[PDB]
Write a protein that binds this ligand. Structure first.
Ligand SMILES: CCNc1nc(-c2ccc(NC(=O)NCc3ccc(N)[n+]([C@@H]4O[C@H](COP(=O)(O)O)[C@@H](O)[C@H]4O)c3)c(F)c2)ccc1C(=O)NCCN1CCCCC1
Ligand SMILES: CCNc1nc(-c2ccc(NC(=O)NCc3ccc(N)[n+]([C@@H]4O[C@H](COP(=O)(O)O)[C@@H](O)[C@H]4O)c3)c(F)c2)ccc1C(=O)NCCN1CCCCC1
Lengths: 463, 463
């Protein structure tokens, strides 16, 4: 990895565009204008890409050679990068202040600020915008995942009277559905801020290396079938496949995809009759978890539950909702996203089925179908010092008031009512709103403040 | 990187689920059911993750330890992985056959197949589904990028009479808007299959390392401003910022973001009057490229062109379309995706503006706002050998006929009319449809056939 080659191309030319005699460039990140966001992911970026000796004579030469051909011209700031190498042993003369990871902040607040600590490096602040802005991803995954948790919590509490099993109710199936191995690890880790279930193995190692947990692992899974393991037996032998699988995993929970040919026949005739004796004998710690994977998500879930309710002994819980026996559950792992999740749980509640009967799986919808514009994540310069004088800077496009950026030196504070406010124009300097909530997390090549994954989960908890 | 930890968790448990006495598992990848797709990206995956010695005693131990905690149980196939280590020096006993990269194939055709070459490794075929399926990303980016090229080609030809400059008409601005550094490189490279412009520097190194080009670099950029470089001068000095920038880059093309405060005032008064003398003197090889970045994309483009057409000498080309003088162009780099692109060029054509006047920049829309379901990318087992007998395997869910998979051994062929057809059930064995277009690209830990980036671009060319 070469930080000199990890920026948008045009930023290579910016050192020639700032006003002459500019000694400071100060910029900030916010989720402009999903009313609250979970701040998570910066620590990974700081450690993997920004800390330590990130400049070498070799990296400078490689960048110079690439840019000469890429621009068909010499515009690369060789002198500037060499200065960092010689003066700071290749450590970035930058200071980043940020809100603690896991914190849940309303939209439109400063989440982190960046500024150069050496006047010669005024151009460096915005050079690293590209890498830092990618924090939009873990923030958005974490936020969208927590919003789904809010829905599950509401419906589980209503139908059951408690939140038992909530943290296992939305499972990450997104490994194959994301754009890369790196994305998989980052995305899965962001989901784990809220839940404990993932099949995206890459997330475990990331958390362990960059954040850390008291527990051996931050996420868990259970044995489960895929279409290949059912279909390989041949169409006429779907029952043999089911029998073999539940027998192989007789003492642990096991998820079995049941829609290979006819989900309804599988539930009613195969599980419901042919193999019923192998299901009712299972332990409460080892249920069979029936998995539909096609058709309209809500219709399928309701029909599967109706079928099962007629083949197995259902009870009515203390809230009046129907509950399958403890050795039998369902997981809907197809077509689940923040929208459909809501429709499913509401539909289940209307038909009197407890949310305790089900878990949900989501892959592309959880980790891939998200963009930087969902929370309007944006990085902008709000303050500069030129000829020794500080000036408050901002953009304010005529046609889009929503794109207006904040002015001057920023700070994040608690309001008298205990809410959040971002003070602009250095106003935090007046001591009218208590201390600034942002902490220095990076300074001159070193990570100065960090959080464990356990702390982050705690900060991200639902009310 | 540890391949034993680079799969969906449940796949760890599959070796106990397949029918007993299974010696072969054969699976394929297709974009089920955007009528044609560009096959690109597999070579990157093969080289980065699958080739050579990918198993070590250490990697086996690490996986065993992770899985014990992740499943809270011992289900890991230690013996199976040890066999690969001891028998093949940790090289994967797998054969992958694929259509040549860059090929444009209609939906619903086999693109690549996977199978184990050692009966003991029947479980390995699908272990690597997760990593291989991630090829959906570069395929989708390449395809979506090419579809945008088709739109630009149609409108440029109509308004100009030729395709000059088509290869630079859609520029990649997606570095910051993607989910990770790795995604950025892969995504940018996929866009470069069709175009030559990118600010996503990560793409250059990827192409150079895994594919290769005759030219020093596969992609290019030009100097350009960002809001920070304009706003840093202070609101009242937007003109000074513009003047400094065009002067610093007087002999090369330069893109200048002009919507910081009022895009219309900037075009009419600043560029159009105050600094007009610095624009009309520019070389045809170094135009000023005005960049709006906010408001309704079509309305803004039309209004900017109308303004410019009244301040600068416009000509009418041989097709009857208006053309700005050669030292002046526009780039619309906001709100551009496959849908809006079409609306913009059609709107321009209606108002008699040549497509020669404009280039488009797309970031999140080009590289992030895409999912695996856009082209229905899916990997499924279609053939197995159990007890020495081959059987054709498939799924066919009752509620969704669209999820039906192909049966048996597959091959890709040309039809007498020159189209494509996928033969099922080993029917390719009959020699009625010429040779199989799939070629062995990976076998037993070695990449057996590779393509240069130049060959790929050639294969991906528009008709
Ligand atoms: C109600 C059940 N409760 C629970 N369930 C689970 C649970 C259920 C199922 C799975 N696993 C699967 O089901 N594995 C299948 C699969 C895997 C990957 C993958 N990738 N896919 C495919 O990936 C594609 C991507 O889809 P895309 O297109 O991208 O959207 C999709 O198609 C998929 O087919 C499919 C799982 F791990 C966990 C866990 C805990 C509880 C719970 O409550 N515990 C606490 C209580 N407990 C305390 C202890 C004592 C007992 C009580
Ligand atoms: C008509 C013009 N013709 C051409 N133009 C170009 C061209 C124009 C502009 C730029 N560069 C910018 O404009 N740089 C700005 C920017 C950069 C990155 C970035 N990241 N961003 C931001 O990234 C965010 C992500 O946005 P998101 O939210 O994710 O969507 C967005 O906001 C952006 O602000 C913004 C560029 F490189 C190239 C090239 C060739 C031709 C052409 O025709 N040559 C052949 C003919 N030629 C032959 C030779 C002789 C002369 C004639």
């Amino acid at each position: 990895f070469n930080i000199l080659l990890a920026t948008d191309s045009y930023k290579v030319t910016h050192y020639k565009q700032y006003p002459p005699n500019t000694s400071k460039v100060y910029s900030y990140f916010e989720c402009r204008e999903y009313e609250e966001t979970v701040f998570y992911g910066l620590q990974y970026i700081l450690n993997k890409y920004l800390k330590g000796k990130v400049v070498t004579k070799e990296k400078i030469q490689e960048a110079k050679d690439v840019y000469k051909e890429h621009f068909q011209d010499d515009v690369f700031n060789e002198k500037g990068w060499n200065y960092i190498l010689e003066k700071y042993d290749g450590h970035l003369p930058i200071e980043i202040k940020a809100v603690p990871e896991g914190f849940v902040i309303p939209r439109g607040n400063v989440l982190f600020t960046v500024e150069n600590t050496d006047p010669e490096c005024y151009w460096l602040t915005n050079w690293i915008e590209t890498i830092l802005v990618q924090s939009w991803y873990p923030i958005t995954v974490a936020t969208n995942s927590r919003e789904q948790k809010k829905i599950l919590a509401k419906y589980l509490l209503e139908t059951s009277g408690n939140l038992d099993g909530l943290e296992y109710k939305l499972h990450d199936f997104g490994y194959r559905g994301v754009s890369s191995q790196e994305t998989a690890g980052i995305g899965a880790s962001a989901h784990l801020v809220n839940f404990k279930g993932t099949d995206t193995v890459a997330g475990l190692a990331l958390i362990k290396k960059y954040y850390g947990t008291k527990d051996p692992v931050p996420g868990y899974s259970v044995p489960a079938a895929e279409h290949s393991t059912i279909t390989a037996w041949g169409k006429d032998h779907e029952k043999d496949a089911f029998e073999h699988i539940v027998t192989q995993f007789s003492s642990v929970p096991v998820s079995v995809v049941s829609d290979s040919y006819d989900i309804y026949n599988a539930c009613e005739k195969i599980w419901g009759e042919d193999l019923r004796h192998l299901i009712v004998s299972r332990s409460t710690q080892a249920p069979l978890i029936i998995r539909p994977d096609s058709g309209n998500p809500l219709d399928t879930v309701l029909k599967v539950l109706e079928i099962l309710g007629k083949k197995f002994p259902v009870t009515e819980n203390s809230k009046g909702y129907k509950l399958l026996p403890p050795y039998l559950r369902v997981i809907q792992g197809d077509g689940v996203d923040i929208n459909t999740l809501q429709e499913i749980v509401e539909g289940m509640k209307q038909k009197m089925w407890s949310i305790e009967n089900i878990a949900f799986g989501s892959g592309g919808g959880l980790l891939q179908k998200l963009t930087r514009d969902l929370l309007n994540c944006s990085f902008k310069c709000s303050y500069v010092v030129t000829n020794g004088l500080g000036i408050n800077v901002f953009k304010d496009p005529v046609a889009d008031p929503n794109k207006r950026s904040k002015k001057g030196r920023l700070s994040l504070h608690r309001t008298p009512a205990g809410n959040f406010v971002t003070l602009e124009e250095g106003k935090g300097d007046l001591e009218e709103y208590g201390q600034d909530l942002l902490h220095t997390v990076f300074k001159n090549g070193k990570v100065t403040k960090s959080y464990s994954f356990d702390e982050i989960r705690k900060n991200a908890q639902l009310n």
